[PDB]
Amino acid sequence: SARSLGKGSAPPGPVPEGSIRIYSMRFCPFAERTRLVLKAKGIRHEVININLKNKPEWFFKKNPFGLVPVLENSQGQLIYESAITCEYLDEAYPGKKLLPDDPYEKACQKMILELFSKVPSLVGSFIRSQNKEDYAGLKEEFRKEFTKLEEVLTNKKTTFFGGNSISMIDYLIWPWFERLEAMKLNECVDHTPKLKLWMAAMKEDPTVSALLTSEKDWQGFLELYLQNSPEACDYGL
Amino acid sequence: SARSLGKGSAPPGPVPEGSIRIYSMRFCPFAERTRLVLKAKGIRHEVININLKNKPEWFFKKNPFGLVPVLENSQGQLIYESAITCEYLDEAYPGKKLLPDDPYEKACQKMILELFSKVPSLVGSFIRSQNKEDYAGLKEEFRKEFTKLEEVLTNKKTTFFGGNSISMIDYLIWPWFERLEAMKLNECVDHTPKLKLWMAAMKEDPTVSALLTSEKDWQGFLELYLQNSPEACDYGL
Ligand SMILES: *CC(=O)N(C)Cc1cnn(-c2ccccc2)c1
Ligand SMILES: *CC(=O)N(C)Cc1cnn(-c2ccccc2)c1
């Protein structure tokens, strides 16, 4: 069931009532945002993994851009863009709100999200390594963006980006910091002490911990991704 | 009072109670989003224009990135990023909501906002013209992005991007289409009929009409902007 669907696969059936479907990929950091929210809010759902190297024809009817995550509810309504799927889930399901209701506090979370906006592209580029001379410069980009996040935590004087308790903004940023060890980028935070403390606090969170991927599984994916293998998305069953 | 403040100007005083302040620029399309929301919701406010060619030192304390629009309330709280200032105003002030309360409908508006995300950078690049051979290709980029917006209106079968009545998403996209005539880009919509009808419907909206800038004022700004003049932001008093 967890095996990714690719080109030639049958379009899935309708989403049953009382459940929501996520079109994801087990190693995708953008899809992980949504999976963190689904877990934190205890939402009943089904997972359909997509082979991003060999996409099913029908997935373009889910998202014309062909990117995961994509949410589909029992009414056939489709929601995509990882931050949008997270806010939609926060609003459409009961329980504690991950995004604060206060207009100013909610705006601050989205202001930090904008501040982080360069990091996913920097990670994407770093994975597809070109030469040794580029690495030291691409790591200089990481230090610059991570100091922006350090200044936020310094000015807030709190453990998390939305206060002294975990909230939406922390789950939105976490997937890229989770992969820092597997990418051998642990030195890019050696000058951001509050950010380093935030990473360890995140690893202790029950939701984050339950969705943690082993160092070996990250490596297995990365190796097959650099080989452009259509088995990359299915590493480690 | 409407004259823009620049380097060497005195930091402004506190925002009085019952009012909100916008740090803007009369010809900035990003700041225009916020000004459209302030008008549509009938919000009492004050406008401080910033000389973007000769920024005041204190403006970096309002937005570390030094970009307009920036909101400041009586509590000294600062809000920036044009879409964030618009949603904050919609949530923190009474009256009709510009963003629908329905989680799915609100998500769709933000999905269209993401779809439009390439157009502001394409406009920014087009203003700073390099050569005649680039123009036809940069206009091919516009047709490609405008067809994405055409497909939305076609699939929705409504006059606006959020239904048969104007809503937030329309004010968020409008400033770039308003400037299409002054930029001589009217041929980039000659293959998007619903988008052309949306533009004329927008021009009839009371809020849009009250914030319309004359063709002569757009030209006066553009000429001085291409000359890198610090008088550009203050064209036409
Ligand atoms: C959904 C998506 O954009 N991808 C699957 C690309 C991607 C970006 N970052 N990763 C990543 C990085 C390090 C380790 C595992 C996965 C994948
Ligand atoms: C706030 C900002 O980004 N600017 C002032 C730059 C800008 C982008 N587009 N315009 C523009 C385009 C055509 C006509 C007037 C203004 C300014």
Numbering used by the authors:
A (entry chain A), B (entry chain A): 5 to 241
Paper text:
In each case, difference electron density maps contoured at 3σ show each inhibitor covalently bound to the Sγ atom of C32 in GSTO1. All three inhibitors bind primarily to the hydrophobic or electrophile binding site (H-site)5 of GSTO1, but do so in unique ways. C1-31 and C4-10 bind solely through hydrophobic interactions, whereas C1-27 binding incorporates both hydrophobic and hydrophilic interactions. W222 is rotated and pushed aside to accommodate the phenyl group of C4-10, which is inserted deeply into the protein surrounded by W222, F225, L226, I131, M187, R183 and V127. The pyrazole group interacts with P33, while the side chains of residues M29 and L56 from the G-site interact with the acetamide group.
Among them, the omega GSTs (GSTO) belong to an atypical cytosolic class. GSTOs have a cysteine residue at the catalytic site in place of the characteristic tyrosine or serine. Consequently, instead of glutathione conjugation, GSTOs catalyse thioltransferase reactions similar to glutaredoxins. We determined the structures of GSTO1 bound to three inhibitors (C1-27, C1-31 and C4-10) by X-ray crystallography.
